[PDB]
């Protein structure tokens, strides 16, 4: 009934999700309702811009995908997954999708804006997080994966770049570009090199255990300041991952190392998160013996770090990108491919 209060929450969470999953929100705004301010992210998989919604004056982060470019990258089904999943989920540590729409040329997903920036930014600059600091963030990802995995979702891109820091110092997971709802096994080669579980690299069928492996990587990176497996090129990273060996900094506590040995376990029959006890093997480990799990969910734990507020609209925590116009063709592109978006 400790773990059974958890089940009452998770069964209600599931009812809520299934309603939206089976009946997704569609066409809830239009481009010319937003003022474009700044590009705060780019990449092969679209771009992200700070925008202001005119009728409210709220700031949001607007993801823009070129439909023709999605097709070329063979990410149609993955993009349909991203939007359908994000419009259906509701958890304190997931970024909220406020609007979605499309025009002749692009797809748009408008999320709440987090002026605080990504964890990546802050972690690289500070160098490393203390164990208590690492633990606070890791507890939020533990709860988030509990949530997601109970909905049959695998997330598949855990890394500091995808975690935003809010105004209270708590985390928000963004970018669901590889998230998928799957019972049983799946096979797609996706993720980021440093975070991939051995089973992905070896093209085996895999499951939600790959998210628990990635948690191992993240905790390590947070607490060490560098990842457990690094080299100059991906192929050298994969050799290290599939070797079975991992070295821990001397400042790592004996409880942290033991947690990590169990998350970064090549043998799926022994990896924490994947066994008969599930998430509780993680939640009840000695490293999290001080962690009040409900207090974390309710955001009543004091955060180790709160980013400096410079206003709504401030972009000081993001880098500078080349501004590219939003072309909207007069002919509809890829209508059938993205009909459900």
């Amino acid at each position: 009934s400790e773990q059974e209060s958890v089940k009452e929450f998770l069964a209600k969470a599931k009812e809520d999700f299934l309603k939206k999953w089976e009946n997704p929100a569609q066409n809830t705004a239009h481009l010319d309702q937003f003022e474009r301010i700044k590009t705060i992210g780019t990449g092969s998989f679209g771009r992200v811009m700070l925008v202001k919604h005119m009728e409210t004056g709220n700031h949001y982060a607007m993801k823009i995908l070129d439909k023709q470019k999605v097709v070329k990258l063979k990410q149609i089904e993955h993009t349909l997954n991203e939007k359908r999943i994000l419009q259906a989920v509701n958890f304190p540590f997931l970024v909220k999708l406020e609007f979605s729409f499309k025009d002749n040329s692009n797809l748009y997903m408008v999320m709440e804006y987090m002026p605080g920036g990504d964890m990546f930014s802050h972690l690289r600059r500070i160098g490393r997080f203390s164990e208590p600091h690492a633990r606070f963030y890791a507890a939020q990802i533990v709860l988030t994966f509990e949530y997601l995995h109970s909905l049959d979702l695998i997330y598949r891109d855990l890394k500091p770049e995808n975690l935003l820091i809010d105004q209270q110092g708590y985390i928000k997971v963004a970018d669901f570009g590889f998230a998928k709802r799957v019972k049983g096994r799946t096979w797609t080669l996706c993720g980021t090199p440093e975070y991939l579980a051995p089973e992905i690299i070896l093209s085996k069928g895999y499951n939600k255990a790959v998210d628990w492996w990635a948690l191992g990587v993240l905790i390590y990176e947070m607490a060490a300041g560098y990842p457990p497996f690094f080299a100059d090129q991906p192929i050298q990273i994969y050799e290290k991952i599939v070797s079975g060996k991992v070295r821990f900094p001397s400042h790592f506590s004996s409880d942290l190392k033991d947690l990590l040995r169990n998350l970064l376990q090549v043998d799926l029959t022994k990896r924490f998160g994947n066994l008969k006890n599930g998430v509780n093997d993680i939640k009840n480990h000695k490293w999290f013996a001080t962690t009040d799990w409900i207090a974390i969910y309710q955001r009543k734990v004091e955060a180790p770090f709160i980013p400096k507020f410079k206003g709504p609209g401030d972009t000081s925590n993001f880098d500078d990108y080349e501004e590219e116009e939003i072309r909207v063709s007069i002919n509809e592109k890829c209508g059938k491919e993205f009909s459900e978006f």
């Binding site: 891109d157 770049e161 797609t188 996706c190 980021t192 090199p193 440093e194 300041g225 100059d232 090129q233």
Partner: peptide
């Protein structure tokens, strides 16, 4: 040191996702 090796590497910036 391991830290010095990381900081001198080509993979200290934001990392891109892979795909097939």
């Amino acid at each position: 040191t391991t830290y010095a090796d990381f900081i001198a590497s080509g993979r200290t910036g934001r990392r891109n996702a892979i795909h097939d």
